[PDB]
Amino acid sequence: AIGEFMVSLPRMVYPQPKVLTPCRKDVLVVTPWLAPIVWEGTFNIDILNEQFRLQNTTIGLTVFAIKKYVAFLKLFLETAEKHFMVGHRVHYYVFTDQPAAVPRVTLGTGRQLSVLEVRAYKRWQDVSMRRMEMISDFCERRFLSEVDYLVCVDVDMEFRDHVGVEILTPLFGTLHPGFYGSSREAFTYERRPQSQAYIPKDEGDFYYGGAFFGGSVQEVQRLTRACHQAMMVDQANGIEAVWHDESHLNKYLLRHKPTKVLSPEYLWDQQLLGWPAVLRKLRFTAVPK
Amino acid sequence: AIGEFMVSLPRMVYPQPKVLTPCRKDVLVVTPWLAPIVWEGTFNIDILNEQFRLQNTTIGLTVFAIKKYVAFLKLFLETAEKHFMVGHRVHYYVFTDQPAAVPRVTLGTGRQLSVLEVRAYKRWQDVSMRRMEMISDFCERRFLSEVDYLVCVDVDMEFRDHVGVEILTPLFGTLHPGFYGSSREAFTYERRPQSQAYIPKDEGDFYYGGAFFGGSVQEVQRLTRACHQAMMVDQANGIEAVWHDESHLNKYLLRHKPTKVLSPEYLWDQQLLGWPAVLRKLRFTAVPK
Lengths: 289, 289
Ligand SMILES: CCCCCCCCO[C@@H]1O[C@H](CO)[C@H](O)[C@H](O)[C@H]1O[C@@H]1O[C@@H](C)[C@@H](O)[C@@H](O)[C@@H]1O
Ligand SMILES: CCCCCCCCO[C@@H]1O[C@H](CO)[C@H](O)[C@H](O)[C@H]1O[C@@H]1O[C@@H](C)[C@@H](O)[C@@H](O)[C@@H]1O
Ligand SMILES: [Mn+2]
Ligand SMILES: [Mn+2]
Prior knowledge:
2 copies of one chain form a homodimer.
Chain A: E1 37-38, H1 45-53, E2 58-65, H2 73-83, E3 89-96, E4 111-117, H3 124-129, H4 131-146, E5 149-153, E6 157-159, E7 171-174, E8 212-216, H5 217-236, H6 244-255, E9 260-262, H7 270-273, E10 284-286
Parallel strand pairs in A: 1-9, 2-3, 2-5, 3-4, 7-9
Antiparallel strand pairs in A: 5-8, 6-10, 7-8
Helix pairs in contact in A: 4-5, 5-6
Bound molecules: the ligand CCCCCCCCO[C@@H]1O[C@H](CO)[C@H](O)[C@H](O)[C@H]1O[C@@H]1O[C@@H](C)[C@@H](O)[C@@H](O)[C@@H]1O (2 copies) and manganese (II) ion (2 copies).
């Protein structure tokens, strides 16, 4: 459940927070609209686990495995079993054009998987973009009745460390690993005013990655519907945004500020970018080709 | 309104947040349960004003002026007019045993004041403690229909700088100015196990001040009802907590973590404590005697 009467926390013994010591001296840990930016060292997972377990939280995880991408499912799901929301109720939703190609992965107690058959588009760009329509449609069909939060991710990835309830909030985006240190002028936002995803050179907070976003079912429905409708307007106007669904996600999150932002710990590519000092953990990473 | 469909923010030009620069290097700006700790330098007030104005936010401010404390109302209200939630809808609620002693203070547009007549208790301790019962009772009578958030403060104070929508959240407490740098063992929590306010030496996050707390009407109702019921149990058991309502507030906020914590900028005494380097602004301060 979300936003329902909360019982008291039990007695807990943990180190006292230190008012006169910053939790990080090397990174920004709160946005200018007072949303936490989630880095290792900012949170006590024991306190957060208590808070979310007492609310009997269920987390949905959506993933698309269309055409050749079914090959990524086995590693994705097996590593999710090790690292994603362990101890909490989880419902995996696998969107695929090939239900028979979904691997039989052994799941821990309180965790389930549903296969949702969808159509395959020819262009990889359309497969990617149409995730917004499909997620929005299923928010109405299944998600509202089955989960409290939705986490929407790319499939060609693996979990390598803890991804837990610290991410949960009404609306979150994730700092794209290629651009977290970049100035806004260098962000690869859509720059053509003819597109619904247009962002001028003097606007923008962060460059969010299309590969990892989420929130409450209500807020994810709103985001995905808005991005789908914007893409349809663009299509009618004969324009396709430079980075497809990610361009629209960035426009939406500029105009509707997320209530948490995840650090690049949560979306990384070690082959391309190595392992910088600012990342104490690499949690969710690209599978190398 | 709270938690209702939110329109898009307009185009805004402001400095880009800096991912690789901490907003403060001298203080903790987020709790271990990912609640912002509100200090100057953590927030862009222009973004926050937009977010809250678009929701047509109304803020209630409660203050008790019983017996001789009516003398503090003129300065309290005149300085609130200069500094508290300017630009937003405000409803002042003055609880008093002397309706005729309430000064005629000139209010800005969209701001109103109601006088609520209540009984006076003989002991200053009971006057202070019974605020919990009275606030809870009025949450049901007026507050649910009239305001979105409630801010509950001591009257023998004055505003000296901005106190705005940066504080608003479902539940907040404020770091007591006497103890923000203290270890938990030194906190003046209630230490007798016979009291409902009991906190052991190895528990506690912060020492919150009884003089400044608030949140959504729903969360304030819960807090004030819980503290009142706990005080009644103590009374039946022949025990009175060491710091009265503040002791119970601290027990409640230990077991129900606030969603924002205000720095001592928001609750200060310059005569007693001066003006430390960590305070860039002194916002709400004790009136000297
Ligand atoms: C600061 C110097 C500029 C250097 C920036 C290097 C990162 C580029 O990143 C790409 O960024 C694009 C947006 O501009 C899209 O998000 C694309 O999906 C992404 O590539 C994806 O994510 C990457 C991390 C890799 O895993 C790549 O194989 C993926 O296709
Ligand atoms: C670290 C060295 C220890 C030194 C600590 C000095 C601050 C003491 O503070 C008192 O703390 C009490 C709880 O323990 C109550 O909250 C009391 O209301 C408060 O006095 C109030 O607030 C004060 C700031 C003053 O304005 C005082 O006049 C008020 O009555
Ligand atoms: Mn990919
Ligand atoms: Mn006082």
